[PDB]
Amino acid sequence: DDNGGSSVMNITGIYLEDAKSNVPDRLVDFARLGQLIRIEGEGFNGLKKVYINGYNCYFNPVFVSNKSFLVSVNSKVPTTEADENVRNTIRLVKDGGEYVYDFQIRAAAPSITKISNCMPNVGEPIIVYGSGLTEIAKVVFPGNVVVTEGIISDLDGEYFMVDMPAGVSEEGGSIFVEGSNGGAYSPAYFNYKKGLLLNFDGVGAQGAWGDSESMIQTTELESASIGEGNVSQGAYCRLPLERQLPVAAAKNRCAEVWTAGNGTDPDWLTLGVPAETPVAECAIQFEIYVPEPWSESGFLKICGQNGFNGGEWERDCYNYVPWLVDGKIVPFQTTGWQTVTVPFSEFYKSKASSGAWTTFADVTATRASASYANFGFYFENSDITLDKITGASSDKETEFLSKATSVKIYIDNWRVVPLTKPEYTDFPD
Ligand SMILES: [Cl-]
Ligand SMILES: [Zn+2]
Asked: Residue 58, class by beta-carbon neighbours within 10 Å (0-12 exposed, 13-18 middle, 19+ buried)?
């Protein structure tokens, strides 16, 4: 009998009610906002109020039995912003008395969607973005490098800050965190030195040929320490070069830098990304430094192969226009070196109608069949229409006319990375 038991309130266990779960009535040690919980115990007959973290939560009195009742954890219940004296409590009120019970209340599980710099130096600042990243207590780096000190979390849990510790594995991988809302993994692309194509300091080789005005020679790199927070590492490429300025109001292939290509470049199948990996789960990464604001005109063309004339929006290439956020001009500037992730899915060849890219094997096939396997970049200063970036009809009218430019951009650590994010669920199958 559910209507039996004493008149003195008591909670013995809290269960999560989920119709879409393998354990639809599951005994739990925490509850999240929006969840329906079943509170089991005694003396619940005549229940009048339920407060969760001091917030009055509606409950249906007809679902109340003396040993069990159902209550939804209202979306407006405060968690990290709840008063310390009521935080993580369930209080029950009836005419004959009240009962307080210590129980952990969380918001949605945390998520890491982006790391500001995926190849920092020891002691440099890192910004990790996502959601629900409130009160981060632990950050773990590839190689089981544990950090519990110097973690500053956003009050709104959109980010946290932490310095790069010593001893992080050169194999790289995901970062892992523990905060008030639980655990989360980043994509597996942090400190991924095994995917390095070119760093201009001995990993890979710069390819240079001819005497063209656009050609960046091996003798035309920079090595002075530049950037605040994330500082340059060894030599890197400046593009466009000082000698190439000012770059013409409407021109393409204005500046170019490449890998050695045909002959010495590695087999990309040896960079730790399996052939079967989908194009949305692997990418090209590089660190960028834009000291002065960049807007109105100019863009970077990542060339998967040498066969590009300049000004394309079509094959195994990608046009990085960082001053166009949501079809809106927003000046682009970095305090220091920041990682740029370009999934192979974002490449125009992966968005093609026929021989479209589906996996990394399709990327390796293309580079093996390419006339010139030089991986590289183009600085480009030609006219833009928001459709060439997004939807081929709706944004066709919006134009961003190209102008003369003398913008300074620096790139480094070109690499292939995996974007696979390990699974983290409250209760796995
Ligand atoms: Cl390091
Ligand atoms: Zn370098």
From this structure: exposed
Ligand nearest to the CA of 145: 1
Question: What tokens does 101 get?
Answer: 């019970």
Q: What token pair was written down for 133?
A: 């990243």
Sheet holding 89-94, edge to edge: 55-56, 47-52, 89-94, 97-102
HSE value, Cβ hemisphere, 13 Å, CA-based, for 89: 17
Which residues neighbour 340 within 8 Å (Cβ) at sequence distance 6 or greater? Answer: 285, 286, 287, 288, 320, 322
How do strand 30-32 and strand 55-56 relate by DSSP bridges? Answer: unpaired
395 within 8 A of 215, measured Cβ to Cβ: no
Solved how?
A: X-ray
Distance 122 CA to ligand 1 centre (A): 6
CA 47 – CA 69 distance, rounded (Å) = 9
For residue 15, give the nearest of 2, 27, 24 by alpha carbon.
27
Q: What is the DSSP letter of 216?
A: P
Q: What is the DSSP track for 333-370?
A: --SS-EEEEEETTTSGGGG-SSS---BHHHHHHHHHH-
Dist CA 75 CA 19 (whole Å):
19
| Among 284, 287, 320, 278, CA closest to 304 | 284
Tell me, in angstroms, the distance from the centre of ligand 2 to residue 343's CA: 22
Taking the C-alpha atoms of residue 16 and residue 369, their distance in angstroms, rounded to an integer, is 55
- Set out the domains of the chain in order of their start, with CATH numbers: 1-107 (2.60.40.10), 108-192 (2.60.40.10), 193-419 (no CATH)
194 alpha carbon – ligand 1 mean position (Å):
13
Element of type H or E holding 286:
strand 282-289
Q: How far is the CA of 241 from the centre of ligand 2 (A)?
A: 17
Nearest CA to 204 out of 374, 13, 379 is that of 374
Cβ-contact 256, 238 below 8 angstroms: no
281: tokens are 């789960």
| CA-based torsion, 61, 63, 66, 67: positive or negative | negative
